[PDB]
Amino acid sequence: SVFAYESSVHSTNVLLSLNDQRKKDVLCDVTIFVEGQRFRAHRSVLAACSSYFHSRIVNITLPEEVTVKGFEPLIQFAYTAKLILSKENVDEVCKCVEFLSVHNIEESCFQFLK
Amino acid sequence: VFAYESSVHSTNVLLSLNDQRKKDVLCDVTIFVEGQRFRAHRSVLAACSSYFHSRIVGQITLPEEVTVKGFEPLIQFAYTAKLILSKENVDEVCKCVEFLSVHNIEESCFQFL
Amino acid sequence: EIFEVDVEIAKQSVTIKTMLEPNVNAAILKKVIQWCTHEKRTDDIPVWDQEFLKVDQGTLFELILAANYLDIKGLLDVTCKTVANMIKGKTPEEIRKTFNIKNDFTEEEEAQVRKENQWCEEK
């Protein structure tokens, strides 16, 4: 007889903890330079979320096409599994997701406000 | 202000990190348990334990009190969110989870069996 | 105003303890002092309080107001138990004639409210 303790809150707790580490800049590994502005993140989480960063990593300088306004919510979404959107930045976040190939997000959310 | 709530992003990211450590890519922490090597991340191990948070922050060999048979299920839980108990390692896993004070594990899983 | 010196008569009260750390000065505080000295089914009402509340309806309502102002949970609970006991077993029309409550409703609103809750009329 072999049992298996399954936890439904471990993944969310780990994500919240990682967001705490990123906010406090403790055990942050990857620095991203977008429009001359520096962003701290974890290499593992970035490679896990987006396949673009997964290929790039395996000091990232994002291309001039993307914008800080379209990338800042994406880091919070990656580290918290929740995305905050507005009327001005909906298209920015949409094309940022398309360029970065971020997984687990739904394009229906973008198209609802489009 | 449509605030989308992904219901699989946490689990999917944790499983991606588990695959990452299984392929031994991007890991930066080596754990020596009874002479056995385990590859993991600083952030993931710190974020799922209290002892690991203390030792890793500010910089790993676990003391003799930790057995490999008791640490394989714990790292499997810390990277996959599910912990597997057998009738042989249940006591060792309980001792290791009492030592490390691993989060998100309820002790009810040990005596209730 | 004509308040008894001992603090044990106000320990049960909650409102006084706010500014410690008055409605009217009629016999209501005397009744409150007497009460202080001596499932949520109301059939287990104590005999002393039941026989002590034999005052008229107006005095009972004044005591209810005084207890609510004083935040005395026990006295408010006892008075509400008495009111519910004297309410039980009476149809809404009987209650309204007893309490002289004017009707501010309309006939189809009454029809739909007594239709929506029609399980109770069964025996």
């Binding site: 049992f3 439904s8 | - | 109770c120």
Partner: protein
């Protein structure tokens, strides 16, 4: 000043109407607009389950005790022992005794385990009947699903299960499944592979659902249910073993507030099983739980495994066969349903 007190002080009216039972509450609902708001808001606080036991006896007993019930039921649950109920006239009488919108579930079983009404601390007994009046709790969404044995059809379409809230439901926590005149295995195994607590058994017949065979049960949907289950198998045969397994169950740390302990026993065990003793599982349950009223039956077969489902974790045994873990016989199943707070 008489009308002023009940027409301007809403708190006084609320506290007065709190002592009014649900039937008189709905009587006085139409007194006035303020009284209507007061009765609705008092109904909003009616979240506790209430049971009307009967130490037929129960059908009239609830008829006497329906005037002292402080809640308005939505999903009534009731059970009755075999030879007292058996005879659909009594089932219809109990059907017409409940509100039209109130879905009613009724079971006939060889045995009945029930504690005296009023307080859950009372020592339960084994055998009559009882009742369980689940109100319209916020969040919890119990739905008494029923699946009858079709003569020609044998498969169960997915729309049938999704409509009754079994599948396509990420919130379902406890499924209580009973089988009468036993198709039970196929229905259970249809949703046995979920992260839910499955507890139940084999019963005689179904009384009320607003002969034949099938699966009758309830789906305790909602995100605040935290349950647990143990299997007092053949290794438990005396008081000490039963108390040890009860300690094992208590280790699950299921809250005792708004909680029912469903004992899903076997008809073939009990006084004839335990050597020179009776009421061993009920006594142990009351010892380790001085609350949590003990209900269930003495079923022909048992459905359940040692599982712990809460809002934070699931502790399920890993099995080679998905449905071999659940179905049992000559065992005991002490499910612990908790309906949030």
């Amino acid at each position: 000043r008489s009308t002023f007190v009940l027409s301007n002080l809403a708190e006084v009216v609320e506290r007065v109407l709190t002592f009014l039972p649900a039937k008189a509450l709905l009587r006085v609902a139409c007194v006035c607009r303020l009284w209507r708001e007061c009765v609705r808001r008092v109904l909003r606080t009616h979240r506790s389950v209430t049971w009307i036991s009967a130490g037929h006896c129960l059908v009239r007993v609830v008829a006497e005790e329906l005037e002292n019930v402080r809640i308005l039921p939505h999903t009534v649950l009731y059970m009755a022992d075999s030879e007292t109920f058996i005879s659909m006239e009594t089932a219809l009488a109990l059907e017409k005794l409940f509100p039209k919108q109130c879905q009613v579930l009724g079971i006939v079983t060889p045995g009945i385990v029930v504690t005296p009404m009023g307080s859950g601390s009372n020592r339960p007994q084994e055998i009559s009947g009882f009742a369980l009046l689940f109100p319209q709790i916020e969040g919890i969404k119990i739905q008494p699903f029923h699946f009858i044995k079709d003569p020609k059809n044998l498969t169960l379409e997915r729309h049938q299960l999704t409509e009754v809230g079994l599948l396509d439901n990420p919130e379902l926590r406890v499924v209580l499944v009973f089988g009468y005149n036993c198709y039970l295995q196929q229905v259970v195994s249809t949703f046995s592979d979920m992260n839910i607590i499955l507890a139940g058994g084999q019963v005689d017949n179904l009384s009320s659902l607003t002969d034949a065979s099938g699966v009758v049960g309830l789906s305790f949907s909602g995100h605040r249910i935290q349950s647990a289950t143990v299997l007092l198998n053949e290794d438990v045969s005396d008081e000490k073993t039963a108390e040890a397994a009860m300690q094992r169950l208590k280790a699950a740390n299921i809250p005792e507030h708004n909680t029912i302990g469903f004992m899903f026993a076997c008809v073939g065990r009990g006084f004839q099983y335990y050597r020179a003793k009776g009421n061993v599982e009920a006594d142990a349950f009351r010892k380790f739980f001085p609350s949590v009223p003990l209900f269930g039956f003495f079923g022909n077969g048992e459905i359940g495994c040692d599982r712990i489902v809460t809002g934070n974790f699931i502790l399920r045994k890993c099995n080679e066969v998905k449905d071999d873990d659940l179905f049992h016989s000559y065992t005991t199943i002490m499910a612990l349903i908790h309906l949030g707070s």
